[PDB]
Design a protein around this nucleic acid. Sequence first.
DNA 1: TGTCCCTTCGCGTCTCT
DNA 2: AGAGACGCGAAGGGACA
Length: 492
Amino acid sequence: MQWSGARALEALLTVAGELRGPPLQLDTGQLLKIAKRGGVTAVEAVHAWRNALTGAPLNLTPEQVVAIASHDGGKQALETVQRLLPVLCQAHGLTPQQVVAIASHDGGKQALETVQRLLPVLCQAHGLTPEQVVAIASHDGGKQALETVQALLPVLCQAHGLTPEQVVAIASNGGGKQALETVQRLLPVLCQAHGLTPQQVVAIASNGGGKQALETVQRLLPVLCQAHGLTPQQVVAIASRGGGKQALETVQRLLPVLCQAHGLTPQQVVAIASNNGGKQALETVQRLLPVLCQAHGLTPQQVVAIASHDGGKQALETVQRLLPVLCQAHGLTPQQVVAIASNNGGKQALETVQRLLPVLCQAHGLTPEQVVAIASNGGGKQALETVQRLLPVLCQAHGLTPEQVVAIASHDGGKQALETVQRLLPVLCQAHGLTPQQVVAIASNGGGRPALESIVAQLSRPDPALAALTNDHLVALACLGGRPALDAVKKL
DNA sequence: TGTCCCTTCGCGTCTCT
DNA sequence: AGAGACGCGAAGGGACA
């Protein structure tokens, strides 16, 4: 495509077709996906050994191969997986899914090779579970996290009195080596000098870009409290709730402005920045707040709500754009649009709503009020889309009212709930004698899926705290609490 | 042009009261 | 109920060969 070599672009497009060909069945989006983050060697390599990967001792799925390949160094990983997957699975007892998960990142070769080399000395001499070692390694720069963990885990646990859980939490992100190193250096300083509980320091470090956040706090903590009247707790919030270095800096820079000119409480400013891409939200509310509280739009309170979530920027922009079209064209109050946008993935919901509202309301016979309810949760897009698919099959093949399906959908994780009802409603109702309404009741909550999955596992294989509770109790329990409630009872 | 490592950001799901 | 934690992963940048 680009410019350097000559004429061998044939060979590239040759292969591009043969991967739609018959070991893998790659669609366009996937080849694109590989080509994009993986590069051409990646695409070359998939083809290169696509039969070897599909069967043999590996028996990987296509989407697994895609997953491994579509990353910087993808080629290297694919080669390194062929070599090591069997030995890591047998000689160190990992699942394939685990080996893949290690591999599906930038520098997978380095991660895999380093696991092989250090999985024992960690699990043995530092009593770490393999789960934990995989966790540390399942990230960009895994080699470094692993390697650094080995070096510092004695030191961090002896001299600074940290739990191993905490060390793993820190290392189990991108930039582990850095966060670890930076903690070691700054833990005393931050603790004695700036007066922070080690718990808070670990909180901060246990995100991506922790090194930055630690350093930035040390520097900016005094100022934000002294000059800007923030509590250290409030500062730590920002620095560990996603905002990181960026948010802290942005807060300092934009705090006076948003309070004087745009008239917000610092309590709100913190709320807004205590999230991923605070910087983004903040800057977005600095603009846009006017045009939202004018161009009829909304109250500051409402704007703050929309912004106080991951990807607030997206939400605010999607609101300003689609607010008129939804309100005027599809007949929604601004109150509803705000509700829809006041969640993770607001942009996604609003957009999905606009395109599925009519579809649901004519073709599937829902009220708008219903659609809004479905949309007014985290992962709205997913529910709406799943409702669309699964409504007819749920009502016909499994005989539920719509009002029921909407109930199941109207909760965070709606998608999972619905899907899981589909899998389990039969086995539950016939094999263990539950009644749809019960199964629906269980599902109509947060954590509806794990509730159901738990409820089944229990009935099919009556785990240690057997009998005692009859089925109707387990149901009532699961509605009340869910998987927490059932696990909790099992522990008694 | 590939490989490896680091940081920021966005979406989705579950639980803790 | 809503806030907060957790998991997953895209995207963007830097360093070096």
